[PDB]
Design a protein around this nucleic acid. Sequence first.
DNA 1: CGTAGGCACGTCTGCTCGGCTCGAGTGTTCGATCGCGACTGAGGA
DNA 2: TCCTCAGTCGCGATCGAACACTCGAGCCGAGCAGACGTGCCTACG
Lengths: 150, 393, 33
Amino acid sequence: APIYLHKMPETDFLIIRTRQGYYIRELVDIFVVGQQCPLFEVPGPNSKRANTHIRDFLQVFIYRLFWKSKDRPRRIRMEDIKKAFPSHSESSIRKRLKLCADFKRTGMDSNWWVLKSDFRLPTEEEIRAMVSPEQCCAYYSMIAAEQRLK
Amino acid sequence: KIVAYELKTGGVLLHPIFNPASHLHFSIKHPHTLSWEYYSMFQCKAHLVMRLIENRISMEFMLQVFNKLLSLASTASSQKFQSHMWSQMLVSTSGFLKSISNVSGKDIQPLIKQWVDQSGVVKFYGSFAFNRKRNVLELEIKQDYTSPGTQKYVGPLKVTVQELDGSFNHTLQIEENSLKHDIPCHSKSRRNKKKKIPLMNGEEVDMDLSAMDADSPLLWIRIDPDMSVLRKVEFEQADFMWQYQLRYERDVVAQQESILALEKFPTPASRLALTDILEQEQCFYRVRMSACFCLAKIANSMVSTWTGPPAMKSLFTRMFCCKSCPNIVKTNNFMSFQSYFLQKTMPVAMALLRDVHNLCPKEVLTFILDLIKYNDNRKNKFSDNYYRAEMID
Amino acid sequence: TKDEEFHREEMRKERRRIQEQLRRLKRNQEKEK
DNA sequence: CGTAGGCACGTCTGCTCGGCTCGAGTGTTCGATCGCGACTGAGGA
DNA sequence: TCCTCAGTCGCGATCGAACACTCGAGCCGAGCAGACGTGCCTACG
């Protein structure tokens, strides 16, 4: 997108607030961004690319929760995923956990989804190759436009 | 070279830890106990693993790594302190990986763990089947990991399928328990109309689709085309797919592997494919030099079927002899450097022709002797010693 | 939409249905034993 | 008095059915040239 | 007086490019029966 450098107004400063306090910078350079020329295609609603991105995003989140688990048989809880993705029906989450995990009801690891012993958890570069950040931006543009149209 | 050496005896272990390699009859702790063939294969495997690191982390970041090492060394090289700073001129593995992680933000520790610390190459056996109902291509890739030189690959794997709609790349995840990989296939509407089939590069060509199957759109398959692993591939295509891959591919390693795989199919369509490769300038010359020997082997295998003259003789008289005299060779002008190499390699392959009696024919021996007698080199600006030496060969 | 839509009450009804089905299954188990 | 054998939820398992997307395959329409006969001014008998 | 001759118009004629319809492959959500467990409550020693 074509950008155009303008000097800042003489009255405006930039306040960065966090939990601890306010911080102030001056700004001197501000660009105006023209009409964008899109290089990535935003998917449509209920598209095949849309549902593929939703499934791959849920799978990447599940793999990264398994990597974060400290238990020697890696184990996660279902309501962590239900807190992250609350619009998802639990059939889809159980579909993602069906391969790569199993539910232990009794004994040790009870009410946990332990990782299968034959399953090799993917490395960091494979998980990065699953979903790209630009696909997430295209999905966020689609669902925001879905809301505005709705 | 390295897959032959590592399957022959054990394997080359870059970066051992101090024995770490006990499969081989010398100790790898010191350079002066290494075998000389091991030293040669060590340097060979080291530069191929560096090409693999360039494949994971792009070439400009790789040159930035090398420039950072050289710049640390040249700031070190001007100090006078006795090695407070002169040891920045010495590189290590941990320092090299740390400089890579500094310039790129990715670390290569799985690739380093697989191809450096582990000492093995991988063997791939592939076979496909086209499902016409669901329009999919079911690949079947199995590894031989129980041979003495081999190891098991669990990473991703690129495969390139040339169908009628073009060339498509697919990434396959080859875990330990994996055997069947279903990839999707495109249309076959470039057989409905005669349109040109688009290639791996941007161009498109006219293909003779009479040899292709009616139900499958796919013209050829290549497992790991970019040589992104240290591998030996044994793919089972059909002979027309090998002939299409020899003719219309825009990759020299695929043309070479199709020449190497056409020796098992001595059909006359393969003879036509290799002869069309031999006649074709704008093919890479080392592919035509291989097609000479492949055509000689195929010609030896289809005796009592061969129709006309011996192989490559009419082609030699068409390319390198006079128009008015077929058995007199043209006077030597070696200024093209590709028809020079092809001219000096074609009788060497032509002499491997054999008759039904297992004796070289007296039509090819007489042709070679007339190539020797009528040789005139008083007119080119280049010497004749290699061409005459190949005539003796 | 609500005119064409013709629920916590329905969920309670489903729970009652599950209880009845489970009781019937237990009766079937008693008959088998 | 204690003490083991029957009732509610929660979460997962598995199969069935209906709906939606999406691309391959096939038939249909319409401008874009190709060729034929003809129109119509034109320099030599 | 001719006397055919070169450049171009109107119309059939086919051809390539695109567009509408169909049909199945595959995935996703809902729905329902049920099992595999925890807690919560009664006849027998």
